[PDB]
RNA sequence: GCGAGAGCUAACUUCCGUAGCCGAGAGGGAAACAACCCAGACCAUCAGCUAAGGUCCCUAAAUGAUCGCUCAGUGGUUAA
RNA sequence: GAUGUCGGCUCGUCGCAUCCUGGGGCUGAAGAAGGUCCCAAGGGUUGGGCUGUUCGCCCAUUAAAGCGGCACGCGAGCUG
RNA sequence: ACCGCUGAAAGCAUCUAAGCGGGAAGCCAGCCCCAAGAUGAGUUCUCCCACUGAGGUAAGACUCCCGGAAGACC
Ligand SMILES: [Mg+2]
Ligand SMILES: [Mg+2]
Ligand SMILES: [Mg+2]
Ligand SMILES: [Mg+2]
Ligand SMILES: [Mg+2]
Ligand SMILES: [Mg+2]
Ligand SMILES: [Mg+2]
Ligand SMILES: [Mg+2]
Ligand SMILES: [Mg+2]
Ligand SMILES: [Mg+2]
Ligand SMILES: [Mg+2]
Ligand SMILES: [Mg+2]
Ligand SMILES: [Mg+2]
Ligand SMILES: [Mg+2]
Ligand SMILES: [Mg+2]
Ligand SMILES: [Mg+2]
């Protein structure tokens with residue numbers, strides 16, 4: 001249900017009680033509400049929400065027009081949510097509590113054109129027994145005269161990375177209201193300064 | 206058709222099978238089977254009451270068509286010229 | 300074949316269209332059947348006649364007569380099944396109107412009746428199922444018995460009053 | 471082609487192609503057969519008359 | 530020597546399907562689409578009338594709705610992902626039942642698929658009528 | 672539940688009951704529960 | 709296909725006898741398909757009758773008539 | 789006028805006559821552990837000694853260490 | 869698979885013909901990702917607008933430059 005947008009700032013050490021908890025700092029800047037998607041007026045229930053602030057000199061006339069309807073301030077990023085529909089704007093306070101589990105999603109770092117050993121784990125071949133197919137290079141791709149063809153959606157070299165990724169059940173260690181900061185036990189995908197979306201625990205234990 | 210153009214037609218010169226009698230303006234009487242002469246629909250047999258008169262226009266020679274045959278892998282290729290002859294008749298009857 | 304049908308004075312039989320509606324003091328009860336099968340109240344009692352005399356008309360005849368009889372007896376006196384909790388340490392409680400099963404399982408078994416059926420516990424080792432519709436009753440009690448099938452060694456669980464269960468005996 | 475038109479015509483009144491042609495066989499009267507399609511396509515009234523004739527030369 | 534084609538014909542016919550079995554309905558529709566009476570009667574171009582199916586959700590069958598009748602919906606590479614669904618299991622998308630029972634009875638060429646465009650199925654009573662501004666000539670099966 | 676393609680009587684308590692297109696046999700004796708399916 | 713041998717009364721098996729077709733045979737049917745069923749292509753035609761086969765829709769042609777069967781999706785793979 | 793042969797390695801995917809987990813009936817099923825049958829292919833199905841081995845035997849474990857198919861899958865992928 | 873309720877033909881019996889319930893790592897949905905070229909191409913918010921006798925233009929974008937936790941080139 002509820003959630004917000006922020007920036008991955010980094011990972012650091014942090015003891016809680018008597019144990020060393022690795023955490024990942026996230027800036028959940030205040031998020032304005034720019035549009036209310038009513039199912040009646042649209043077709044589904046949702047809320048549009050903005051993040052990084054932009055200079056009006058950089059904002060398209062149309063986009064300015066959009067922002068004027070609610071009249072907050074031009075922002076660089078907009079996204080939507082579900083079942084979320086409160087009043088005012090979207091600060092992580094009251095939203096997330098320390099101890100609550102959360103689904104943290106973002107765009108991974110991408111690795112470009114990675115082989116199969118990297119991409120799909122694979123296993124490649126013997127490095128000593130006399131080859132020409134060391135490191136990677138896959139084995140075969142099919143069978144033979146039967147379906148003389150390779151299966152749709154199979155394991156080959158490709159673009160690894162740049163994917164939407166959602167990690168589930170992360171613990172909210174600490175929350176600094178006013179500094180608009182939040183700490184999350186463990187690692188979140190994507191790079192520092194990356195966009196992250198922190199959503200309520202969807203289907204949890 | 207098969208021979209002899211019946212039906213209702215408003216003075217038109219058509220082209221059908223030859224009509225033996227060579228020449229021109231040879232009165233050609235034909236039996237009817239249907240027609241809308243004066244918006245009066247008349248079926249067969251009864252139509253025998255009315256008959257079509259036509260005059261021969263010219264004895265034209267058909268359009269040139271080459272007759273080709275072929276069976277693969279056995280050779281057999283055949284090529285021969287052909288044009289089926291006719292005559293034009295000017296319809297002008299009851 | 301079945302004809303004699305006991306129709307008292309507290310019952311109301313309505314053969315309107317295909318939906319046959321029966322009114323009574325214990326509550327009204329609707330019972331659907333066929334349209335090709337003739338059925339009405341001739342004089343005092345109720346007589347059910349069949350079109351053909353082969354099989355596709357007699358089966359449904361018996362069926363229908365039976366069902367109707369059940370509706371009547373249902374709105375006249377009502378149906379009630381008597382169960383029994385036999386075994387060691389077996390018992391059942393009551394919460395409002397739901398039945399609380401306690402029979403060897405770690406956590407008690409809550410069973411919530413549907414709309415028209417009611418439980419009763421006049422004794423900690425005996426279950427009473429009361430209801431209007433006989434079918435429903437049967438099905439709910441059936442669910443109660445389904446919780447612990449009498450084992451072929453001691454015969455525990457649920458049983459109908461004087462059920463004859465033969466113990467195989469292991470040793 | 472011609473057939474495909476003829477049975478359509480037939481059907482526009484309450485008969486079919488089988489019934490219709492057959493209702494011209496029973497009567498040596500109508501022996502059009504060829505061109506009939508053109509008649510059902512251009513002159514509807516005429517073809518109606520033919521249908522009516524077919525029914526009249528049947529039952 | 531026969532009759533040329535036109536295009537003035539464009540009747541907007543609406544076929545109810547409430548209670549009617551899937552065959553009669555299907556064949557009827559497909560037939561009117563291809564060419565029921567056929568204007569110029571030509572096979573080159575599509576002269577069929579436009580068919581609008583209402584209800585459809587209340588289509589009738591025999592006894593094998595839950596059984597036997599299994600529409601098959603298979604993927605690109607069905608590597609163990611050969612999707613199969615019962616015909617009642619099409620409460621999800623009713624329009625698919627009829628829609629995808631008629632297309633089978635229409636040619637497989639270019640023009641065929643062009644014809645599928647004239648088929649318009651709606652699951653509902655008075656609602657589908659809002660999708661109907663042109664002719665609304667309603668013609669029952671039999 | 673012994674699946675036999677040849678279900679026949681074995682005593683005087685066996686009763687053949689035709690179900691949903693399947694051959695089943697009821698009996699007080701639970702060892703006499705034969706079924707083709 | 710029939711009548712035999714050989715072969716496990718197997719093989720699109722092999723070896724003889726006999727009939728037909730293919731080989732050198734187009735066309736219609738059997739989805740596709742040498743052989744099977746119907747039929748032997750001189751040439752032309754916006755003509756008609758039939759055979760084998762069929763006549764809801766995808767192709768032409770009665771969602772034809774009367775008396776039955778089968779709750780099976782048999783038809784639309786087999787036996788004790 | 790060429791359809792590259794065994795085994796391994798690599799990479800897969802499918803059948804179900806199911807090795808393990810799942811749901812059942814029956815028992816010479818007290819319990820625990822099993823036996824047998826029926827339903828069920830979602831996932832999983834270890835590492836080593838000898839041998840070119842596929843098999844197979846053995847060490848040590850495992851819920852289990854299933855059987856087959858794909859030109860006894862895979863040499864314009866490797867080995868030899 | 870299997871286990872039951874009401875219950876005829878065998879005016880007994882019966883999970884069954886009408887009807888209904890419970891029940892598997894399987895099926896469908898649920899979870900993560902893609903997805904309108906879903907050519908039936910969908911929905912919503914906002915912007916510039918009613919020129920000229922193919923071309924000046926608005927909104928807007930591209931080229932070019934400097935870079936990048938983006939990347940073979942794009
Ligand atoms: Mg390596
Ligand atoms: Mg190869
Ligand atoms: Mg292929
Ligand atoms: Mg031979
Ligand atoms: Mg030769
Ligand atoms: Mg053919
Ligand atoms: Mg004929
Ligand atoms: Mg015949
Ligand atoms: Mg037809
Ligand atoms: Mg079959
Ligand atoms: Mg070669
Ligand atoms: Mg080669
Ligand atoms: Mg099995
Ligand atoms: Mg045990
Ligand atoms: Mg060695
Ligand atoms: Mg082999």
Ligand SMILES: [Mg+2]
Nearest residue numbers: 859860861862
């Ligand atoms: Mg090999």
Ligand SMILES: [Mg+2]
Nearest residue numbers: 794840867868
């Ligand atoms: Mg060697």
Ligand code: NA
Nearest residue numbers: 729730732733
């Ligand atoms: Na010959």
Ligand code: NA
Nearest residue numbers: 738739740741
């Ligand atoms: Na065949």
Ligand code: NA
Nearest residue numbers: 829830831832
């Ligand atoms: Na498997």
Ligand code: NA
Nearest residue numbers: 834835836853
């Ligand atoms: Na091993």
Ligand code: NA
Nearest residue numbers: 855856857861
């Ligand atoms: Na294998």
Ligand code: NA
Nearest residue numbers: 132863864865
């Ligand atoms: Na090479």
